[model samples]
Target: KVFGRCELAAAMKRHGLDNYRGYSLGNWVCAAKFESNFNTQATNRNTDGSTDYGILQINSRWWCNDGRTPGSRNLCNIPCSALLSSDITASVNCAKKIVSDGNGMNAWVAWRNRCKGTDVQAWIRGCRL
Candidate 1:
């Protein structure tokens, strides 16, 4: 399920992502957009042979257990396959836990490269949430 900007923003707000660890709704929306283009089933492999999963691109090395990334921590203790489901609950919950970590949202390079260093307030404007 690929989500529209407003649609994603609304969901983020509903799930308390706004103001999470000082990242506003716009920041979350922007990062997710760059990470997976809002497609819930997205996945990509990293140079280290670790794979990113789901809309927020939670990584297999530290976040989810894909049974492929060797020595995965699986901090979220979730099966990587669950990240691909359209339900999105696991995706959002895992992302919240991720940012709360020391890495914060900067764990996502896409967020740093794109969402940061910009007036992201504009990202959420006009959304009816």
Candidate 2:
């Protein structure tokens, strides 16, 4: 779904994601914006030859099926295409699982490279949360 930042923030909060699993909501908001601009259908080919899916850009190498990648492992147990849909519930659920799998938000290169230690409040700025 193409969500306004505040809309996404409210949804995340409704899903109980405010500071969930040690990562701040700002971190998630920042990462989501940078990763996909809140576009659910977002995808990108990684330098490792794997594809990233959905808002969080979960990797096909470990989380989803892309048919072309080998040893998918399918940790999320969902089709990569499913991640491309406008509905973000599945994507958010899968992201929770991914973050809990010992990687934390470090799993997202965008988070590590751009959002880590950066001021992220603007990601949810002006939201009446």
User: What are the models' TM-scores?
Assistant: 0.95, 0.92
Q: What C-alpha lDDT, on a 0 to 100 scale, does residue 109 get in candidate 1? A: 94
What RMSD does model 2 have? 1.3
- Who wins the lDDT comparison? 1
For model 2, residues 29-66, the per-residue Cα lDDT tens digits are 88999899989889999877889988888888888888
- List the candidate 2 regions with Cα displacement exceeding 4 Å: none
Which residue pairs clash within candidate 1?
Answer: none
Q: How accurate is candidate 1 locally (lDDT)?
A: 0.89
Worst 10 contiguous positions by lDDT, candidate 1: 84-93
Cα lDDT, model 1, residue 56: 93
Candidate 1 per-residue lDDT, tens place, 68-112, comes to 888778988899889998777888889988998998888999999
The clash count for each model shown is 0, 0
